[PDB]
Symmetry: C4
Subunit: 252 residues, 4 copies
């Protein structure tokens, strides 16, 4: 089965992304103002995209993003059967990637707030794995940034993928996509890294629910958990229309 082979590559690619990305977030959160700031988080997350794509690029195409996979299926470049397989493979591996980071920082995470696991607050460790609303980043405000961020990512991704343009040699597509991830985190109001990936958000968040943080990871922030899933899905559609209207429909 060729589909199973691509799913395994997607799972390994997302495992590298989450483990390498959330590990840098853990160092910054646990070591308050000691191991750098948000620049290291975005640089590590951005460079993790390049490494993950270089590993699983030749096998599954290195989507590593349900929004990216949805965009290709919308453009009829991939079968619709790949959408559930890739999303399940991308979610399974972000769940596994968060487990490795939890094991690496098991002693430090439990000692952040004494001997208890707190979801949100000054002594909050659940923000290492999943994104949570800020003071000015409420549900209405946070929906717009994810829509814009995903649309920008889709437009840049489709530029290096369209067959009408000259083929891009291997070793530059990975860096280009990784450059977008680093730039998006720096620009948009999200200090967690790759906040436009539905698999990178729901995966680790589901792990924290069973790891000991409880069900409060889903019922906090006025039920914020579904926003980083629906919003990038709609942003990918908008990004496809923006690119097609400006560049895609005229490449004869």
């Amino acid at each position: 089965y060729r589909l199973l082979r691509q799913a395994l590559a997607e799972c390994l690619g997302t495992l590298i992304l989450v483990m390498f990305g959330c590990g840098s977030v853990a160092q910054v959160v646990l070591s308050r103002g000691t191991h750098g700031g948000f620049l290291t988080i975005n640089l590590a997350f951005g460079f993790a995209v390049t490494l993950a794509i270089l590993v699983a690029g030749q096998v599954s195409g290195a989507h590593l993003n349900p929004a990216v996979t949805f965009a290709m299926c919308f453009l009829a470049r991939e079968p619709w059967i790949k959408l559930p397989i890739y999303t399940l493979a991308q979610t399974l591996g972000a769940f596994l990637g968060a487990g490795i980071v939890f094991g690496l920082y098991y002693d430090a995470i439990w000692a952040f707030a004494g001997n208890e696991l707190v979801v949100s607050g000054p002594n909050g460790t659940a923000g290492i794995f999943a994104t949570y609303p800020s003071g000015h980043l409420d549900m209405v405000n946070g929906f717009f940034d994810q829509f814009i961020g995903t649309a920008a990512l889709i437009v840049c991704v489709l530029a290096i993928v369209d067959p009408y343009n000259n083929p891009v040699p291997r070793g530059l597509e990975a860096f280009t996509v990784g450059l977008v991830v680093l730039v998006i985190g720096t620009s948009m109001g999200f200090n967690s890294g790759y906040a436009v990936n539905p698999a990178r958000d729901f995966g680790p968040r589901l792990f924290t629910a069973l790891a000991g943080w409880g069900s409060e990871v889903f019922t906090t922030g006025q039920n914020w958990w579904w926003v980083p899933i629906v919003s990038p899905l709609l942003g990918s559609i908008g990004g496809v229309f923006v690119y097609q209207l400006m560049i895609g429909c005229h490449l004869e």
Copy 2:
């Protein structure tokens, strides 16, 4: 119409540059000493050039700069009819790019100085979109830096564009130009990023005039608004002569 197709690519490319660039400036200005310093602003602006060129490079040549377009027209490498079309397309998209950043940070920008929009001062938000004079960066002083910065950018750009040299494969021209933008911001006295682009300056500045900042964005700094337009236009001419005299005229 082929010209219309190139104009759309230029508008999209400048939209990516301004939205990704001014978004990082907004985070630094609004979060005073929290989301990094000037290194993040220059890195985000420099990497935004690479992404914008990689998107619109194959369609319009990825000028994204009225000074760069003027240099090509001066060297007779492009028709003079492209100068008004590209400048209008580059300005329209910097205006649109600033609107996206304004929408992203609408709540934070309005709360910077209470419930009012101030152009200049310690509680100033108009500096996110457009450049304003500093204490040692007056009209006479600020004219020289933009002249030198644009001349350096033109010389570097013409090195990778001249047909006499070996053709540069796609995926390295974008990074080379982006490297110049990051270096120029670090070297010259401008903490806003890409301060040598007439479209990146007048575009967002015009948006702030209608967004609510008033007409003071044009009548402040002893009428500074026209400097980041005239000065890079003259610097591009000087950069063309410097490159042609040293390298261009001898490439037989």
Copy 3:
């Protein structure tokens, strides 16, 4: 003898890595909070891998890591006779690389704690050359990070090396491996850089034993010296199985 030629390249490559890497660590440790933080250490160590690979890549394959060499021998891609030759060549050159750094900072190192050489503590200089346990990085905790870090490095390295994939042009393999080293240091809990290299650890540590620090460099931290040797050796085996099971065994 072809084997002797490859050993000389490995010694020179590891000499460049340790001298360029440990030199940045010396500046940060000696200049407490003056010459940057851990970002510079990881960037210098990561970029040193790229330079070392670009130098000795065409002669010996640019392993520069006993764990990497062990992985190739395990996969039957290299003869088992190369394992002792490369390990000796990699250790000899990390010993020499630490000597250059010691000579460069001879006056500053001796004046860190007055006129004495201290192994561990606030006035500790032995941490420039070798890794030492932290408060939350004990022998049991530190074993797991090195196992995970080496496994991640092996998986990424094998992706660009497998002959079934398209050959990678020279000039991108060096940067890809250097990217992994920078990312691993940022993610895992190690503020020394390239903490998954057995030669980079035992080599400089052996130098400090004879340089004047005494035998305490081996008997401190509950005999921590053998951990950065055994743990990456086991992690390389795990990384080989992870890559082969997911990608390697299906590349037909």
Copy 4:
């Protein structure tokens, strides 16, 4: 005359390097702890090498270093007549590059210490253009770092230049050399950037002598001015022998 054409390219390349490099140093020195630290200085200097090489690479080979030119002449790869022409062309352009930086920061430099030009001290501006000894960086100590730094640069440069290896495509040689410059500044004890270039040191230093700083720029630091000239010249010879003995003499 072909030799005159190469000299003009070398002058322009060194002009880009010094103006882009010393401009970042001026911002850090004048804005005490405001425009970043030593990371920006090394990043700007390192990236300036890449831009300068990409401009003058196809015309003169992009040496931009008297030590590098001396190494090629020693290896009989270039005629000995090129040594005085390139050194004069490299020095003329570092003198011109420092003049542009002086004009850019004329008001800020003169106001650093009131209304006077001081060579050394807390209110010292002569360190922007030329290197000066530190507390632990005396003449004997500073000689060794420049010898080691130049030898490391020569070894890395010769790796990508030797014809026996596979030719390096344009667009990667510039980045490789620029990577060495950034790494050397971070590793060795020099917070000025590219402290192993005789032209980058004597050129701007000579400008300060006539700009108003007086002859004290040559008679300070126990006559330190000749060290950054003799030491890299000897280091280039040592770097050539190190590379030839290990790799060069065995490439059959």
